[PDB]
Symmetry: D2
Subunit: 282 residues, 4 copies
């Protein structure tokens, strides 16, 4: 049982929580990490900074930790500026195709893929005031990255393997302040999940679903006090008033990835203490 988690920059995200729970079930974990934060993540790991967090009387497995940039499909896609940037030029094989081939050489076929990354340069702006170039950015890094991720991993994956991504309810209902086309990319990503589920199903016997998670105070969540407010609101209005942990998403992700969800494919599962069901406060 091998899982590649694409998109973990630290310990405060959904990627980490997913990692943790996949370990409880003894699956081997390969982190794919964005180069802007790669050196410093590695450093912290070495300094045993994440050592508290790797606690489960269990200890986390971490098979490998690779540089990974979901905006590049192949090496030909890497622009020269990036190729030479201070933070990339010492690193290698970080395109989507490249990490796919890496992994396969080092470990062969794997059977679990977590897409856990999103990005938009104009997330701060709202839809109307987002540029074409900013919108297409959001969709390229949040939505298309999934598709591409699939294209390349699908054949280093065994039959009956399963894939998941992460989404947010703002695709289905309006959350003012979730901007830059981020809603649009979650909308796109939830649709692609259905279409990919059809293709990967018939053709590769491979499942794909997506988890619509609640608010977590991740690094990326602070890409705009919205989130503190979102957590506040969720903890007062959701059917379940417990605090939403990333491990909560993690245990569901783990389930989706296991053979136990063998007959669930193409779905948007909500893991959010049921907030999505409410129309009216009280």
């Amino acid at each position: 049982d091998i899982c590649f988690i694409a998109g973990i920059g630290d310990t405060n995200g959904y990627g980490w929580g997913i990692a943790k729970e996949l370990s409880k079930r003894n699956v081997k974990i390969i982190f794919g990490i964005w180069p802007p934060v790669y050196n410093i993540f590695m450093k912290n790991y070495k300094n045993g900074k994440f050592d508290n967090d790797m606690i489960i009387d269990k200890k986390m497995n971490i098979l490998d930790m690779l540089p990974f940039d979901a905006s590049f499909d192949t090496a030909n896609d890497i622009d020269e500026e990036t190729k030479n940037n201070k933070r990339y030029n010492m690193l290698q094989n970080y395109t989507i195709e490249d990490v796919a081939n890496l992994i396969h050489q080092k470990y062969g076929k794997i059977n679990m893929l977590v897409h856990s990354l999103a990005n938009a340069k104009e997330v701060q702006k709202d839809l109307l005031n987002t540029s074409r170039k900013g919108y297409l950015d959001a969709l390229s890094k949040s939505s298309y990255s999934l598709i591409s991720l699939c294209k390349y991993f699908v054949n280093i994956m065994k039959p009956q393997s399963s894939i998941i991504s992460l989404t947010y309810h703002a695709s289905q209902k309006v959350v003012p302040g979730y901007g830059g086309g981020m809603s649009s990319a979650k909308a796109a990503l939830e649709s692609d999940t259905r279409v990919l589920a059809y293709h990967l199903g018939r053709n590769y016997n491979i499942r794909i679903n997506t988890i619509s998670a609640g608010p977590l105070k991740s690094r990326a969540a602070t890409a705009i006090t919205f989130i503190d407010y979102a957590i506040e609101y969720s903890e007062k209005y959701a059917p379940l008033r417990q605090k939403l942990l990333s491990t909560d998403i993690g245990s569901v992700a783990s389930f989706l990835l296991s053979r136990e969800s063998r007959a669930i494919t193409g779905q948007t599962i909500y893991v959010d203490n049921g907030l999505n069901i409410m129309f009216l406060p009280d």
Copy 2:
């Protein structure tokens, strides 16, 4: 110990059984509620070892008890003659919803997993348009209201962080000609009620409740549904009652503490398809 009540089962060919088999994998003690009129039969078949092979998991399914259970009656007060003097019913006792909740609580104490796995419409083979008021409401009473009732009476005998599920079918959201009698209307209400109950039980008892929208099984209309499904579903595999059961097991556990009020499709992905090919 962990105890699950499965309300609505008459053989091994259904969901309740698949759900029971899978729960047994986590060593959950199982109590079956059986519709009184087939209860003794079921009890007989059990004795004659008829369910022996279906019961093997290599470990034996631990069936804590098997009780008469009629989802159409809330309390004893509702047992309305004739019924009281009906050939089958009169030899049995304590089969109303509230009565069953008392027995279970008395013999075993509190439980922590509830499964509503029962559907019945007396006119299930006619168009909604040709369904009678009496028929429709029987559908809603047995297949929809029963869920609320079961919750009302069982919440008192459940630990906090308990979990509930029912079974639903996609006919509620999209047209399936053939699923008549108001079974569609029933599931529509069941799914909506699952949301509403999720809010109340969640806030008031920290109890979760979800519904599994399952694909066709077996346990006429079903024979088409299955062929169509295995033809067009994203996933080519045969859908098993344990496929629903393993999902149920998960939903009924703490691993899904943050999921509630949801409709989970376990149908090989049939629901995502628009037109064939």
Copy 3:
């Protein structure tokens, strides 16, 4: 001439009236069905000119007739004593669904627009969780099944390319604490039944059927709903009964020949909002 039957109206403060006003704009002749127990009152108020100003469109609303109408009874056969000897009912006649369809057909011939605008649950102020079986089913019978019944008996007296609508509320899809008694379950089923009826009536009689999911009006719970709505809805304007009526008029016309089985939200866009701001 074009004739619309509006089943479910007791004053000018509701949807049936707003719908009636707007239909009158297209010179549609209107027949009102009134719940028998308030029928004579309504008839009195009509006589005393109480509805005179509400009736002006500058042209006068043409009310073809006003008949007692009880959505809880399908045929005469169902009028079950007491009811037959109830203070209000016994002085009236032909108010069952089938009976009304016969009168209309007899006096005016075929119609071509039907409006189901009636909702009633006897326990509308309690939680779903505290709602009784009797209460729930009354809800489903009056607010949901009535729709099917009305279709069953009226299709015979309708021209082809006829059109039908009912009114629904978003509580069916998402939790609105306060909308209890199974009104939510009712609307859930009404919306699902609208799809199913759309298939049958569409294929079998080329008749269309849709439902309007309206925002709060007036006609307690509503007072909050309205303030919240006018605060948070995408559209700041006050929502009028004629806002629903103008949409209804459209849906009931040939201009919408290619729309059927749909739930149309007329609620200033409230439904698209997740969290406030």
Copy 4:
């Protein structure tokens, strides 16, 4: 009552049918037209070729017919190659900002906007096999064009104005063969419709909805016998067995655009003889 229809290349589309019905109600119509087909559309108009089709005992109004390219927001966005292409270099003011300013000079404020255009270079490929550049193409011309269209027209539009676009059910359910990210763009567009509806509502008292239309044998529909099959299927399985005309979409569009739908905003209305409601054939 002025309406700008963005995206009509001939008489066989939804744009034309919408035009026709808006005329029945005496509203003035400005066609925005893609330059690759502009000269030839004009020619046909002049040769009175469309004269049969402009029949309603009514005759169509056509206030103006402008060149229009929804892939350009402003003149600065026009690449030099395009700027010089055989088919563009004789034409002017065809960016989104430009046609917005044109129209306003010539006629002032308008109050009706029809988005009726879509495009994807790799529509023939299916999701998995679509490139980043092809996906982003679909989203840029089918989804973002709407947003941009709004940004620029919103303030040459009076309060209480209304906007509509066109979508297809493949966003919500899987239609194999509707590829190139076209499903993804309909998914995105239906989401943006909700978010735009919130912003335009509160801020400009302006409504936006989208129509999910059935199959019509438009020029663009043949961008892949899929459609003949789609029309075949729809006419045998839809609740309504009538043939679906573009004027059917047109009369609904007209309604959405009128004050009659004054309280409907942010919605996806299905105009498809109810096919979307079916799960199972028979």
